[PDB]
């Protein structure tokens, strides 16, 4: 299957006093491996997976330098964007940045992205060709002109197609034990009688990795979305994920219903029945 490396950056202004709160997190697929938090004591990029800890001081110095530079760029942007939108100097505002690269099953470049938002709304984003920009409003359109004159896309493309993929491949190999392992969902069904005439069947998927999963209900061999509930996939906190789907059924007719589980770790999809 495909793999990805993604970085997420959030800066939140604190105009009463001091620099913005800045939090950076790096992921390979659904595994967090590094973090920086401006409120933490180290002021260093910190490891959050065992397979990145082996990287030497040159790596950690470099990552710390670059992530701090990101924070200062965001600090500048928060100041100027407040000015463009004629917002008060008292209120808190947010810049968010996400970028990264996907590779296919062959570990070769599939796609890259670089997206930027102000106050939770699209501002500017690199298009899929990595040679052009999507600017949401006129502030961002002026930014596009600036970044086109400065050849930003070319340099970002070099990173996303090259550097990003090279380091992703390094991480995938170094973290093979966990990053290349698939944990198939551990599945079971529960039953709750809400009344004499109504019952809820809940189909559970636990302890799976990666997070991508599909859970669907059928009745008498055909799909059913009517009277179903599907919760958002959620972290277990040990690196794996959880999900469930429920269907409300007539009491005594539980055997008609089947839960179907699709996941990378399952060679063929699983079927559960009460």
């Amino acid at each position: 299957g495909s793999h990805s490396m993604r970085y997420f950056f959030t800066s939140v202004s604190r105009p009463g006093r001091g620099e913005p709160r800045f939090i950076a997190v790096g992921y390979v697929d659904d595994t967090q491996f590094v973090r920086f938090d401006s409120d933490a004591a180290s002021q260093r990029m910190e490891p959050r997976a065992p397979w990145i800890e082996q990287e030497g001081p040159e790596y950690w110095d470099g990552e710390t330098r670059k992530v701090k530079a990101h924070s200062q760029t965001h600090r500048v942007d928060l100041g100027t964007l407040r000015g463009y939108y004629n917002q008060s100097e008292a209120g808190s505002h947010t810049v968010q940045r996400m970028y990264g690269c996907d590779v296919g099953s062959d570990w070769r470049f599939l796609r890259g992205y670089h997206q930027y938002a102000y106050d939770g709304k699209d501002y500017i984003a690199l298009k899929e060709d990595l040679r052009s920009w999507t600017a949401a409003d006129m502030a961002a359109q002026t930014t596009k002109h600036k970044w086109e004159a400065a050849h930003v896309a070319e340099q970002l493309r070099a990173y996303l197609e090259g550097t990003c993929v090279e380091w992703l491949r390094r991480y995938l190999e170094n973290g093979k034990e966990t990053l290349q392992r698939t944990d198939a969902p551990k599945t079971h069904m529960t039953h709750h009688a809400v009344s004499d005439h109504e019952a809820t069947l809940r189909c559970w998927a636990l302890s799976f990795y990666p997070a991508e999963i599909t859970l669907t209900w059928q009745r008498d061999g055909e799909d059913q979305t009517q009277d179903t509930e599907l919760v958002e996939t959620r972290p277990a906190g040990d690196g794996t994920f959880q999900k469930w789907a429920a269907v409300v059924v007539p009491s005594g007719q539980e055997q008609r219903y089947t839960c179907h589980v699709q996941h990378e770790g399952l060679p063929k999809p699983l079927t559960l029945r009460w």
């Binding site: 470099g62 530079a69 942007d77 930027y116 002026t142 400065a150 340099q155 380091w167």
Partner: peptide
């Protein structure tokens, strides 16, 4: 491995 974000790449 984080991007080398050049100083000129602010929005304004």
């Amino acid at each position: 491995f984080v991007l080398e974000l050049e100083p000129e790449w602010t929005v304004k």
